Scaffold this motif. Structure first.
Motif, PDB file in Angstrom:
ATOM      1  N   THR C   5       0.825  -1.205   0.000  1.00 31.83           N
ATOM      2  CA  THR C   5       0.000   0.000   0.000  1.00 31.83           C
ATOM      3  C   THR C   5       0.860   1.257   0.000  1.00 31.83           C
ATOM      4  O   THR C   5       0.560   2.232  -0.704  1.00 31.83           O
ATOM      5  N   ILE C   6       1.953   1.245   0.760  1.00 31.59           N
ATOM      6  CA  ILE C   6       2.816   2.414   0.757  1.00 31.59           C
ATOM      7  C   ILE C   6       3.604   2.510  -0.547  1.00 31.59           C
ATOM      8  O   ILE C   6       3.933   3.616  -0.984  1.00 31.59           O
ATOM      9  N   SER C   7       3.904   1.385  -1.212  1.00 29.27           N
ATOM     10  CA  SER C   7       4.568   1.479  -2.514  1.00 29.27           C
ATOM     11  C   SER C   7       3.657   2.106  -3.564  1.00 29.27           C
ATOM     12  O   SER C   7       4.100   2.954  -4.351  1.00 29.27           O
ATOM     13  N   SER C   8       2.387   1.696  -3.601  1.00 31.08           N
ATOM     14  CA  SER C   8       1.451   2.332  -4.530  1.00 31.08           C
ATOM     15  C   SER C   8       1.281   3.810  -4.200  1.00 31.08           C
ATOM     16  O   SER C   8       1.225   4.660  -5.106  1.00 31.08           O
ATOM     17  N   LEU C   9       1.179   4.133  -2.906  1.00 23.53           N
ATOM     18  CA  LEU C   9       1.076   5.528  -2.510  1.00 23.53           C
ATOM     19  C   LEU C   9       2.305   6.304  -2.947  1.00 23.53           C
ATOM     20  O   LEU C   9       2.200   7.455  -3.371  1.00 23.53           O
ATOM     21  N   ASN C  10       3.476   5.684  -2.869  1.00 27.77           N
ATOM     22  CA  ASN C  10       4.694   6.355  -3.293  1.00 27.77           C
ATOM     23  C   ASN C  10       4.683   6.615  -4.791  1.00 27.77           C
ATOM     24  O   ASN C  10       5.071   7.697  -5.234  1.00 27.77           O
ATOM     25  N   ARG C  11       4.229   5.644  -5.588  1.00 34.49           N
ATOM     26  CA  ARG C  11       4.184   5.837  -7.038  1.00 34.49           C
ATOM     27  C   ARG C  11       3.236   6.963  -7.428  1.00 34.49           C
ATOM     28  O   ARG C  11       3.619   7.891  -8.157  1.00 34.49           O
ATOM     29  N   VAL C  12       2.006   6.932  -6.913  1.00 34.20           N
ATOM     30  CA  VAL C  12       1.056   7.977  -7.286  1.00 34.20           C
ATOM     31  C   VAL C  12       1.480   9.331  -6.735  1.00 34.20           C
ATOM     32  O   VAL C  12       1.383  10.347  -7.427  1.00 34.20           O
ATOM     33  N   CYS C  13       1.942   9.381  -5.488  1.00 32.27           N
ATOM     34  CA  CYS C  13       2.328  10.650  -4.891  1.00 32.27           C
ATOM     35  C   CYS C  13       3.554  11.237  -5.564  1.00 32.27           C
ATOM     36  O   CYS C  13       3.629  12.450  -5.765  1.00 32.27           O
ATOM     37  N   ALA C  14       4.535  10.412  -5.895  1.00 31.08           N
ATOM     38  CA  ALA C  14       5.690  10.942  -6.589  1.00 31.08           C
ATOM     39  C   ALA C  14       5.292  11.475  -7.951  1.00 31.08           C
ATOM     40  O   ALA C  14       5.778  12.531  -8.371  1.00 31.08           O
ATOM     41  N   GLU C  15       4.397  10.777  -8.653  1.00 29.72           N
ATOM     42  CA  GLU C  15       3.924  11.313  -9.920  1.00 29.72           C
ATOM     43  C   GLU C  15       3.228  12.642  -9.722  1.00 29.72           C
ATOM     44  O   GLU C  15       3.408  13.572 -10.517  1.00 29.72           O
ATOM     45  N   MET C  16       2.418  12.748  -8.675  1.00 34.51           N
ATOM     46  CA  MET C  16       1.661  13.970  -8.474  1.00 34.51           C
ATOM     47  C   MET C  16       2.584  15.115  -8.130  1.00 34.51           C
ATOM     48  O   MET C  16       2.384  16.242  -8.599  1.00 34.51           O
ATOM     49  N   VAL C  17       3.609  14.846  -7.318  1.00 40.13           N
ATOM     50  CA  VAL C  17       4.580  15.885  -6.968  1.00 40.13           C
ATOM     51  C   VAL C  17       5.366  16.320  -8.193  1.00 40.13           C
ATOM     52  O   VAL C  17       5.568  17.515  -8.414  1.00 40.13           O
ATOM     53  N   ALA C  18       5.826  15.367  -9.007  1.00 42.80           N
ATOM     54  CA  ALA C  18       6.552  15.745 -10.215  1.00 42.80           C
ATOM     55  C   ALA C  18       5.695  16.645 -11.093  1.00 42.80           C
ATOM     56  O   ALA C  18       6.118  17.745 -11.482  1.00 42.80           O
ATOM     57  N   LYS C  19       4.478  16.203 -11.400  1.00 43.61           N
ATOM     58  CA  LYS C  19       3.642  16.985 -12.294  1.00 43.61           C
ATOM     59  C   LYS C  19       3.364  18.358 -11.702  1.00 43.61           C
ATOM     60  O   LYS C  19       3.531  19.381 -12.382  1.00 43.61           O
TER      61      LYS C  19
END
Ligand SMILES: [Zn+2]
Lengths: 24, 1365, 218, 56, 30
Positions: C5-19
């Motif tokens: 769950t934290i890995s998926s959160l990391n993927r989506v959150c990192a994408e959101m921060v980058a964008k």
């Protein structure tokens, strides 16, 4: 080993929120 | 101190003529600026009213005049040579002997080919006769001579514009062309102007309301039209281009009756007449129709392949565009119905005419033969304002994706070169997917980038390129103009039209004087100017356009910035080109038909592979860039170079400037001394420029463009190849198909894939702000026409006329040197031969203009006074045909004026100029039966040239005739540098003992016991003396030399008198050969068969005093034409050379054979030049620094060369030491560890193939090379473990080119030969022993002086880090 | 156990921060807020001085709806940006060929002025425009030109093969006198037979006001 | 707290989705706003001389 | 250090909620 990861998120999101903070 | 240019080089701007007409009492309204109506007349031209000649000229003319836009087409037909002109001797007299030379030169060419083995089987019995008829009946012959007389007159007139000699008067049959300094009045008959419905000429419609023009022109039959001398210059350029084009077409018909590649000269002439008619009715606007010549030619070419629905869509869009343009510019202009039907003949012919693709591609290069529109400052600022001020809607998601692909492509480029990832200093959590690849240290494949694309945003790393990579300091001295600073911005407009005097003068607007005047100049100081945002200082917020010349579009402009912002721009361009921009290689030329199938398939792997492109206009991107779009890329370039705010400069400076045009006679409207500080916006000037400027940050914008192309490649999924050249960007989409598919179907599907890529790219760039207009971008399947060479399905099309029609007796040579002019013609002739399959048309045009230059400078030299027969003050008796024709047969390197070497038809770069020149001279003399005149022409008195000259020009001889003015110019720049150059890092570089050091360095590099001039030159390029020679070599204009504020200030004899002395001496050398002859050398050279020997003993005798008996090696290579003799073979026959030799006799040879396969043929397989076969075209350091500086890189190179050359001697290190001590802070052992110097071999041979500067390209079209197999294995021993003087790459260029020449016009099926042997002539080749250089002493100079000089030194070469293996 | 769950959160959150960090970098410190943007629309014609952010649909609306808030520049910008959405592989590069442009394109190929072929062309473009078959006509014409045919052959085949010309009768053109037709048109014309076709019969028939009617032939 | 993790996952997924439906209009002050920003950071004073193109 | 994870997740959710709140103030809603 989650700490770093989640800490790392706080090390970015907060900063960019601070960026949007200057705008408003 | 002035010098009128020979050719058109400035934009046709006629605003100044508006004052002339007001002084003469006339009326004109060229300028859109109301200021020029009522401004105070310049005192220069106010005096026209006191002139008697001008008053008597315009006494019988109405006050009204007409714009020269509409009269230019009239002059191009009305003017002839039949009247009286005040020029003696007239250029028409020369004709009778120019032809005598042209024919003779043609004859030589034919003779040359007869002994090389490249003569056409079919012999035109009347070939000379046809040439004579063609030249005589050319319809622009007498007009061209007349226009050269007018140009002569107006040149003399401009040179002494303030003196009484300015006025000149010419009375043709019906035109009077009285002319002032740089204003030409034309008196023309009203009767020959086309009328409109209202009853006034179409010229009058723009300026005069009807019933006011006919009341002004009441009883008058003649009307005047004031124009600048530049219009006379461009009409001369038109007429000479038209003459070349019609002569070229006619001579092609002579050499190829069936189907010549040039357009038939009748059609071209009709095109000229249509275009001129159109111009006489429309005006400068007519160019908005002439401009559609090139797109209509590209359409008509494309339709010459198999017809696919999108093939005709090019021509339909262009045809629709032409009609819409023609309706829009003629809507409000009353044309009689006759005129409406006839103004359309231009594009009507362009559509109807059916020609082979090659003919159309030659016609393509006549677009500028109708002129260039009269640019206005106002119409050229509106264009940029509408595209640079418009608000744009951007989709961030696309900007995000483009930026991530930008980073992705830089990471990928770094990975491939450095062999591993860069040190990722960012958080590893932020890149969950990427960190795994980094750990395995392998780069993610292209398919999987799609999901990981966003991760790239989070990669961070230390600076990935160095801030000191510039090596050619000449970029900072390279001659140009720069805007004056903001405090004195209005100094560029002249004070009378400006209406007030500019409160602050400007010191200079020239870049060389500015560079020399900058004390604290250094690259880190340029950076400190940038990073500290000094370009935002008030004095540097200035920017000023300047209309580009020779442009058919309504004015297109190029920016100029204040000198320091200009240095920042040059640094950013230099930084990107050597570093980041290499991550988006846009030079990748792709022609799918020629490339091997396997490499192509593995290249498009992401079966068969098909590529189809679509070409867009990258030029219009520049105005559409926006900072909301360009911020991430710019920030990243800064962080990638370890600076701050450097690559950022334009979007911070330009938006905050007062954009205007630095037009001397047209200030921005309403400009006064009251509002000089805060100028008003107007039609000429505008304030906010939220955008780009053409040229500025070309390297960055092309990088974002390749980023968008790669984003489309990731999304759509096809293999995209992006290539930019000039303004266009061609994106070739490669799509893979299964092998079992229909060839007709796969082409259609490939074109469809290209159109799908184009639609995606339209969406991408539209979101990025750059609107890709789908009407004007076209999907081409198989027609690659961007770039230097156009291909139709891989058959190379010729574009010869774009260089063959630029030949002219007058060129922009230093002073008015004959040699410079002849050299230009020789260069245009080499290039034009390269890019077409016809030899004799361009040979005839270059011969014609060579002789005509000789004569025209002989009498009318602009440097010397009027009526100064240069042929008399040198020869005492008049130069005859005999003397000129023999001074044009001595190639320049022997000392003479022959720059038209026949051998250049076989290949471009020449193995040895002395040996080739000697062979040419020998064949000429054998033709004209003057063999005995050989040795005397060769053996001259060696001149007095130092070792510096030898090192700068290795291959040459020490003959004063064989010298271009470069030495003289470099001495003048040196004098001006030592005199009034306050630059700190130039005075240190050019210290007092500069000259002594260059002499010592040069004697040393040549002090080796075997002397190798080329190696000397190579090291010298790295030594500080080479840097001084690069800085000095920046003067290449005559006006800059003769009118610079920093050149003419010398207290010695004036430049002009020295130039006259040099001219007269040079003329003496060239045209008196009996005088300047040495008998000793003539005895030495006697009875020696082969050219290579002659060349080596002559080369050693010339430089005797520098060699001092030590042998000279590495400077003489055989003239390949004598080395190899050609034996053609009919099928099923053996060549006599191979039969006479039992085992060893004449065995060695190069075998050439034809390939039966024809991959592609357009229009058909009739000519070899039309078809392409499948054949191929032609056939370590211990520790490497990661970001080497230019100084360190040159240091390593210098060390590598020194070690390799001096490998035999054990003191190699002791030789290297001084040079590296002026360049790096490294011990020799450290550099030797950084050197890749581990390889060994024959020094000389491996010096010519890979270390020689020339790449040895062929001068003949690639279409015939693919049709041939060229095997060098039959050379026996000489075939590649052997060393020889044989230059293999030119043997292949020579074999291919010779086969092309012999059959360039014959029908392919009628070629009675299938195999060729190029056998070795025994006498003229020999094995070159491997040797090594052995210096017996060391350079004793202490080059450590350059420690402070950061242009030269490199204090801390190991700063960017180091890598293993 | 939250590793997945934290890995998926990391993927989506990192994408959101980058964008969203790129969005911050692009729109500088002077980005106009939604409220500020529309205030500036209201009290001034133009957009506010600084980038403004909109949802696609937000400005899709109040642009499709007649309203005075959007400045003309913003409407033009958005229309340009959305013009490229319609582009596909079929749509890209296809010209918009009207009846008038089709006439001008076909004239230029025909030699002379006022020939019978010119009248044929302005008839063909009239039947085509009504039947909305211009594209087919032009495709036919271009294909005929390419396939080694003169423009006369192209017109006669464009009258044969195009289906709108199956059996349609020639149109009638009223002229006050027989001299209205151009001189090049005087050569080939004959009295009109009953029930004609446009090519199997006759090109076109000019019925004069005084009864007379004459038809043309290729 | 798996409920907080799923809630944050959903909010982030919605933000990323709403990003693809963004459109921005380039302003007249972006270059000048980045210039004031780069000049205040580097020198600590506003850019000197006459006002820039679109100052706040 | 699980209490550290709860505190930092609370902080991270707080800052993401703040960013959502700032988004709707920048971007026009409908
Ligand atoms: Zn042989």
């Amino acid at each position: 080993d989650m700490a770093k990861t989640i800490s790392s998120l706080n090390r970015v999101c907060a900063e960019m929120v601070a960026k949007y903070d200057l705008l408003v | 101190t002035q010098y009128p240019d020979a050719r058109l080089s400035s934009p046709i701007v006629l605003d100044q003529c508006d004052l002339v007409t007001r002084a003469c009492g006339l009326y004109s309204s060229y300028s859109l600026n109301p200021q020029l109506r009522n401004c105070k007349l310049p005192k220069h031209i106010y005096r026209l009213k006191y002139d008697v000649t001008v008053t008597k000229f315009l006494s019988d003319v109405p006050v009204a005049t007409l714009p020269i836009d509409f009269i230019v087409p009239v002059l191009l037909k009305a003017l002839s040579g039949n009247g009286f002109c005040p020029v003696e001797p007239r250029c028409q007299q020369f004709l009778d002997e120019i032809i005598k030379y042209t024919m003779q030169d043609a004859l030589f060419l034919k003779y040359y080919l007869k002994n090389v083995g490249a003569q056409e089987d079919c012999v035109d019995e009347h070939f000379q006769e046809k040439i004579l008829s063609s030249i005589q009946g050319n319809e622009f012959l007498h007009q061209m001579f007349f226009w050269y007389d007018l140009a002569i007159l107006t040149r003399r007139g401009r040179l002494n514009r303030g003196n009484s000699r300015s006025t000149w008067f010419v009375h043709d049959d019906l035109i009077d062309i009285l002319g002032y300094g740089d204003y030409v009045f034309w008196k023309i008959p009203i009767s020959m102007l086309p009328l409109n419905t209202q009853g006034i000429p179409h010229a009058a419609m723009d300026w005069y309301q009807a019933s006011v023009f006919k009341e002004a022109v009441q009883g008058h039959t003649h009307i005047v039209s004031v124009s600048t001398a530049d219009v006379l210059i461009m009409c001369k350029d038109l007429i000479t281009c038209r003459f070349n084009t019609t002569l070229i077409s006619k001579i092609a018909e002579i050499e190829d009756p069936v189907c010549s590649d040039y357009p038939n000269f009748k059609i071209v002439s009709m095109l000229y007449q249509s275009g001129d008619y159109l111009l006489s009715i429309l005006g400068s606007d007519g160019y908005k129709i002439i401009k559609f010549l090139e797109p209509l030619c590209l359409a008509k070419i494309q339709l010459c392949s198999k017809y696919t629905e999108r093939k005709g869509r090019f021509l339909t869009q262009m045809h629709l565009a032409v009609n819409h343009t023609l309706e829009e510019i003629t809507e409000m202009r009353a044309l009689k119905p006759s005129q409406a039907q006839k103004i359309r003949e231009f594009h009507r012919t362009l559509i109807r005419l059916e020609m082979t693709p090659q003919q159309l591609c030659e016609l393509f290069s006549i677009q500028k033969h109708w002129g260039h529109p009269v640019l206005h400052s106002e119409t050229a600022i509106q264009k940029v304002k509408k595209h640079a001020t418009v608000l744009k809607a951007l989709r961030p998601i696309v900007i995000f994706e483009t930026y991530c692909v930008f980073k992705y492509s830089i990471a990928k480029h770094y990975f491939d070169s450095q062999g591993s990832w860069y040190s990722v200093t960012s958080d590893r959590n932020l890149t969950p997917g990427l960190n795994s690849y980094i750990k395995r240290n392998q780069f993610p494949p292209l398919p999987m980038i799609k999901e990981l694309l966003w991760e790239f945003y989070h990669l961070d790393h230390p600076p990935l390129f160095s801030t000191k990579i510039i090596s050619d300091l000449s970029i900072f001295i390279k001659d140009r103009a720069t805007a004056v600073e903001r405090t004195c911005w209005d100094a560029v407009f002249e004070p009378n039209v400006l209406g007030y005097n500019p409160p602050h003068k400007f010191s200079t607007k020239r870049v060389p004087e500015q560079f020399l005047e900058q004390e604290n100049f250094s690259i880190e100081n340029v950076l400190s100017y940038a990073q500290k945002l000094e370009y935002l200082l008030p004095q540097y917020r200035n920017f000023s356009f300047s209309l580009k010349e020779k442009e058919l579009n309504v004015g297109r402009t190029f920016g100029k910035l204040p000198y320091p912002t200009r240095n920042v721009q040059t640094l950013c361009e230099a930084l990107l080109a050597d570093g980041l921009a290499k991550a988006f290689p846009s030079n990748m030329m792709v022609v799918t038909e020629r490339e091997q199938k396997e490499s192509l398939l593995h290249q498009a792997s992401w079966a068969t592979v098909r590529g189809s492109s679509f070409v867009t206009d990258l030029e219009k991107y520049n105005l559409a860039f926006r900072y909301e779009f360009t911020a991430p890329f710019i920030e990243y370039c800064n962080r990638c170079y370890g600076v701050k705010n450097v690559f950022n400069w334009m979007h911070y400076t330009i938006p905050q400037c007062y954009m205007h045009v630095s037009d001397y006679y047209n200030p921005p409207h309403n400009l006064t001394l009251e509002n000089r500080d805060n100028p008003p916006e107007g039609p000429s000037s505008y304030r906010g420029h939220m955008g780009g400027i053409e040229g500025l940050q070309q390297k960055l914008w092309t990088s974002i463009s390749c980023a968008q192309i790669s984003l489309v490649e990731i999304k759509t999924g096809f293999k995209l190849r992006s290539a930019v050249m000039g303004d266009n960007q061609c994106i070739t989409v490669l799509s893979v198909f299964p092998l079992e598919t229909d060839a007709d179907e796969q082409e259609q599907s490939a074109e469809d894939n290209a159109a799908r890529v184009a639609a995606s790219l339209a969406k991408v760039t539209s979101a990025c702000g750059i609107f890709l207009k789908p009407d004007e971008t076209f999907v081409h399947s198989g027609f690659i026409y961007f770039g230097k060479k156009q291909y139709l399905n891989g058959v190379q099309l010729p574009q010869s006329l774009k260089t063959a029609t630029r030949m002219a007796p007058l060129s922009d040579a230093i002073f008015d040197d004959l040699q410079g002019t002849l050299a230009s013609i020789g260069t245009a002739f080499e290039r034009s031969i390269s890019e077409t399959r016809h030899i004799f048309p361009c040979r005839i045009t270059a011969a014609f203009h060579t002789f005509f230059s000789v004569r025209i400078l002989q009498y009318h030299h602009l440097g010397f006074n009027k009526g100064f027969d240069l042929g008399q003050l040198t020869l005492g008796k008049p130069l005859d045909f005999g003397t000129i024709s023999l001074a044009l047969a001595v190639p320049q390197v022997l000392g003479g004026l022959s720059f038209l070497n026949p051998e250049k038809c076989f290949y471009r770069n020449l193995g040895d100029p002395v040996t080739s020149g000697l062979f040419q001279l020998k064949t000429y003399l054998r033709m004209i039966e003057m063999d005995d005149l050989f040795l005397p022409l060769i053996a001259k008195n060696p001149g007095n040239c130092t070792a510096i000259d030898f090192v700068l020009n290795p291959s040459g001889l020490n003959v004063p005739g064989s010298q271009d003015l470069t030495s003289f110019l470099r001495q003048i720049v040196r004098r001006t540098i030592t005199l009034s150059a306050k630059n700190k890092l130039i005075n240190t570089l050019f210290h007092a003992s500069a000259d002594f050091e260059d002499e010592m360095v040069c004697k040393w590099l040549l002090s080796s016991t075997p002397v190798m001039s080329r190696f000397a030159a190579d090291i010298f390029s790295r030594t500080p003396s080479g840097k001084r020679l690069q800085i000095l070599g920046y003067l290449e204009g005559t006006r800059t030399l003769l009118a610079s504020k920093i050149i003419n200030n010398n207290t010695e004899t004036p430049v002009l008198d020295r130039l006259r002395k040099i001219t007269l001496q040079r003329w003496s050398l060239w045209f008196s050969y009996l005088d300047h002859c040495d008998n000793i050398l003539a005895e030495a050279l006697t009875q020696i068969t082969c050219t290579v020997d002659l060349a080596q003993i002559l080369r050693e005798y010339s430089w005797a005093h520098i060699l001092e008996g030590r042998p000279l090696i590495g400077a003489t290579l055989p003239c390949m034409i004598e080395q190899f003799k050609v034996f053609w073979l009919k099928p099923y026959e053996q060549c006599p050379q191979c039969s006479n030799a039992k085992q060893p006799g004449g065995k060695p040879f190069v075998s050439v054979a034809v390939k039966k396969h024809i991959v592609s043929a357009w229009p058909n397989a009739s000519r070899i030049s039309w078809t392409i076969g499948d054949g191929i075209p032609y056939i370590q350091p211990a520790i490497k620094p990661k970001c080497p500086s230019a100084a360190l890189r040159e240091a390593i190179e210098l060390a590598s060369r020194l070690t390799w050359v001096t490998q035999g001697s054990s003191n190699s290190d002791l030789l290297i030491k001084p040079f590296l001590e002026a360049r790096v802070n490294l011990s020799v052992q450290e550099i030797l560890q950084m050197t890749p110097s581990h390889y060994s071999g024959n020094i000389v041979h491996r010096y010519n193939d890979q270390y020689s500067p020339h790449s040895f390209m062929a001068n003949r079209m690639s279409n015939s090379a693919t049709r041939l197999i060229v095997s060098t294995n039959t050379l026996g021993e000489f075939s590649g473990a052997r060393d020889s003087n044989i230059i293999f790459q030119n043997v292949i260029n020579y074999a291919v080119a010779l086969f092309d020449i012999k059959f360039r016009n014959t029908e392919a099926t009628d070629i009675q030969y299938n195999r060729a042997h190029l056998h070795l002539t025994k006498c003229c080749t020999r094995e070159v022993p491997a040797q090594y250089l052995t210096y017996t002493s060391t350079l004793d100079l202490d080059l450590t002086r350059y420690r402070e000089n950061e242009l030269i030194y490199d204090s801390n070469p190991l700063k960017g880090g180091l890598n293993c293996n």
